[PDB]
């Protein structure tokens, strides 16, 4: 069972760590940041699940939890054409999705607060060893 | 040599990833949190500078720059006595520090209102690759 119909498929179980499976591409992260207000370098989800919603093109809704900080910008689901990118039959295992973080708008007010720093001393006991 | 007054240590440079030296007893790292209200399995400085201001014990003022969030708690300097733990010599480079990482008002306040999640969905674009 290599090839399946997409309208199908009830629901996408995509992690950070795994990758695709591909034949005529390269395999890439189920799971990939790829811009946004927050960008990618620091917080991301490891785990995000999609739910079939319809067919037309079946349209994904791609949810998780994530810190009330960030919020989804655009994201996109792409899976691989079996036979080829015209195909509506899609191989096990291809589908990936990218999306963008960006910062709420609490998020925003706190990144206004955050990375201040001070200059902290201490009087430090002592002791020989 | 390798051997020098306590006294006359008047600067201290420790850094997180780097080793004290030893005769009598283990290397242990220059700079290790041990404890405090914030912990130490989150943020912790990498280098601390400390300034010999006075004999009596002997007394160290160790500063860095800290997040606002965090504040220094208890620390405790000590060094390998060279022939022994009475020696007022030392050996050179076996000076370390230890310190309790504690949050500050401001840290403990931010604490209160973090880790709080929402269930964030996103209606996803697709395209057959």
Same mark, same amino acid.
Request: aromatic share 12%; with cysteine.
């Given at each position: 069972?290599?090839?399946?119909?997409?309208?199908?498929?009830?629901?996408?179980?995509?992690?950070?760590?795994?990758?695709?499976?591909?034949?005529?591409?390269?395999?890439?992260?189920? $799971?990939?940041?790829?811009? +946004?207000?927050?960008?990618?370098?620091? /917080? !991301?989800?490891?785990?995000? @699940?999609?739910?079939?919603?319809?067919?037309?093109?079946?349209?994904?809704?791609?949810?998780?939890?994530?810190?009330?900080?960030?919020?989804?910008?655009?994201?996109?689901?792409?899976?691989?054409?079996?036979?080829?990118?015209?195909?509506?039959?899609? $191989?096990?295992?291809?589908? +990936?999705?990218?999306?963008?973080?960006? /910062? !709420?708008?609490?998020?925003? @007010?706190?990144?206004?607060?955050?990375?201040?720093?001070?200059?902290?001393?201490?009087?430090?006991?002592?002791?020989?060893?």
């Amino acid at each position: 069972p290599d090839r399946m119909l997409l309208r199908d498929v009830k629901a996408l179980t995509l992690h950070y760590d795994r990758y695709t499976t591909s034949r005529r591409l390269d395999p890439i992260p189920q $799971l990939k940041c790829v811009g +946004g207000t927050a960008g990618c370098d620091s /917080y !991301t989800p490891k785990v995000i @699940q999609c739910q079939n919603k319809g067919w037309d093109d079946v349209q994904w809704e791609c949810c998780t939890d994530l810190d009330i900080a960030y919020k989804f910008g655009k994201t996109v689901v792409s899976c691989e054409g079996y036979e080829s990118s015209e195909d509506q039959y899609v $191989l096990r295992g291809s589908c +990936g999705l990218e999306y963008n973080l960006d /910062y !709420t708008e609490l998020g925003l @007010q706190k990144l206004k607060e955050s990375g201040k720093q001070h200059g902290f001393c201490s009087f430090s006991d002592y002791y020989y060893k």
